[PDB]
Amino acid sequence: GSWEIDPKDLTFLKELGTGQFGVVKYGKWRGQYDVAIKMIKEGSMSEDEFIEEAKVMMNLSHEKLVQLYGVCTKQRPIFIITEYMANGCLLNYLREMRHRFQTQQLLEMCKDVCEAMEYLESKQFLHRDLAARNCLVNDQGVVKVSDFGLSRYVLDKFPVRWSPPEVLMYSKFSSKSDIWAFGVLMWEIYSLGKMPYERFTNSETAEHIAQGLRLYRPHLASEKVYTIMYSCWHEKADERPTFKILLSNILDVMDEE
Ligand SMILES: CN(CCNC(=O)CNc1ccccc1)c1ncnc2[nH]ccc12
């Protein structure tokens, strides 16, 4: 199948991490091309649904989306073969104080993610778990959005701190719950990877959000940048912007700043 990679074409070279979803390895495809090999933990996913969705996933392609190259499903664990992102998870990258980021770099990180999300929104595709922990950074410092849609197939920890009131109260998912999570991700970037609502538990965060209270301005965000992330948190989902509008707003601030 066109979504199917021959696992014999892989050379495993380095372990990149282990986690709830499984083990990830760096390797080469046909001796030459860098890949990530994501090995799905046995029993962790609805595998027939995941495999059918991978066929749809094959047609999603954008420079700021982690590229899916194929799956290996004729054995277990199944493998997801993806773009290799040398600098790892965005959350860990932000927390690495040596980079001494300028705010121009932080705004570019936001734009990278917003372009990916604008593309997913043009395809009516929801990420459903957008957060810095689900973005990756390549060897050039480019941020890309990873594992978009994956939570649908996970059989098991919910992202309370990235969820709007209507998700927490009613499980109402929409383009506007991705918009809300994007604003939280902007806050994560400008806070150099702090936990949102760091002094609260999830249960306390949910109550805070419902009472109408919000995250507030990171020290490194200008007034114009804060306006953008705060616009993502309107109580009323329909008053939140689209990713097209957020991209335009981010580009405008890049020009001003
Ligand atoms: C460290 N790391 C991220 C590892 N975490 C995940 O991929 C989590 N998802 C997942 C895991 C197992 C099975 C199914 C899904 C990477 N480092 C460099 N390039 C990369 N490309 C892609 C990932 C990736």
Q: Say how far apart CA 135 and CA 217 lie, in whole Å.
A: 22
Report the C-alpha gap between 24 and 252 in whole angstroms: 38
Output 148-153 pairs: Cβ under 8 A, ≥24 positions apart: 148/60, 148/65, 148/116, 148/120, 149/53, 149/57, 149/125, 150/21, 152/49, 152/53, 152/128, 153/45, 153/46, 153/47, 153/49, 153/50, 153/53
C-alpha 23 to ligand 1 mean position (Å):
8
Resolution (angstroms) stands at 1.6
Residue 41 Rama label (left phi>0; alpha psi -120 to 50; beta): beta
Task: Tell me how far apart the alpha carbons of residues 185 and 160 are, in angstroms, rounded to a whole number.
Answer: 13
Length of the chain: 257
* CB neighbourhood size of 158 (10 A): 11
What separation, in Å, do the N-terminal and C-terminal C-alpha atoms of the chain show? 48
239 alpha carbon – ligand 1 mean position (Å):
34
Residue of 10, 12, 14, 16 with the most ligand 1 atoms within 8 Å of its CB, for mutation = 16
Residues with catalytic roles: 129
C-alpha 178/C-alpha 203 separation (Å) is 21
Instruction: Measure 202 CA to ligand 1 centroid, in angstroms.
Output: 25
What whole-number distance in Å separates Cα of residue 251 and Cα of residue 29? Answer: 36
Among protein residues, the one whose CA lies closest to atom 9 of ligand 1? 21
Task: For residues 150 and 45, give the distance between their C-alpha atoms in angstroms, rounded to a whole number.
Answer: 9
Contact indicator for 149, 192 with CB cutoff of 8 Å: no
Domains of the chain: 7-83 (3.30.200.20), 88-256 (1.10.510.10)
Nearest atom in ligand 1 to the alpha carbon of residue 22 is: 12
| Cα atoms found within 13 Å of the Cα of residue 69, Cβ hemisphere only | 21
CB under 8 Å to 145, separation ≥6 — which residues? 64, 65, 66, 113, 116, 117, 120, 127, 130, 134, 135
Say if residues 130 and 162 touch (Cβ distance below 8 Å). yes
36 phi and psi angles, rounded to 5 deg = -95, 135
Ligand 1 pocket test, candidate residues 42, 136, 148, most atoms within 8 A of CB: 136
d(CA 187, CA 204): 19
Q: For atom 10 of ligand 1, which residue has the closest CA?
A: 21
Pocket of ligand 1 (CB under 6 A): 16-17, 19, 21-22, 24, 36, 38, 40, 66, 80, 82-85, 88-89, 136, 146-147
Strands 79-82 and 135-137: unpaired
- HEC readout, 4-57: ECCHHHEEEEEEEEEECCEEEEEEEECCCEEEEEEEECCCCECHHHHHHHHHHH
Strand partners, 137: 143
3-state secondary structure the chain: CCCECCHHHEEEEEEEEEECCEEEEEEEECCCEEEEEEEECCCCECHHHHHHHHHHHCCCCCCCECCEEEEECCCCCCEEEECCCCCCEHHHHHHCHHHCCCHHHHHHHHHHHHHHHHHHHHCCCCCCCCCHHHEEECCCCCEEECCCCHHHHECCCCCHHHCCHHHHHHCCCCHHHHHHHHHHHHHHHHCCCCCCCCCCCHHHHHHHHHCCCCCCCCCCCCHHHHHHHHHCCCCCHHHCCCHHHHHHHHHHHHHHC
Residues annotated as binding site for ATP? 16-24, 38
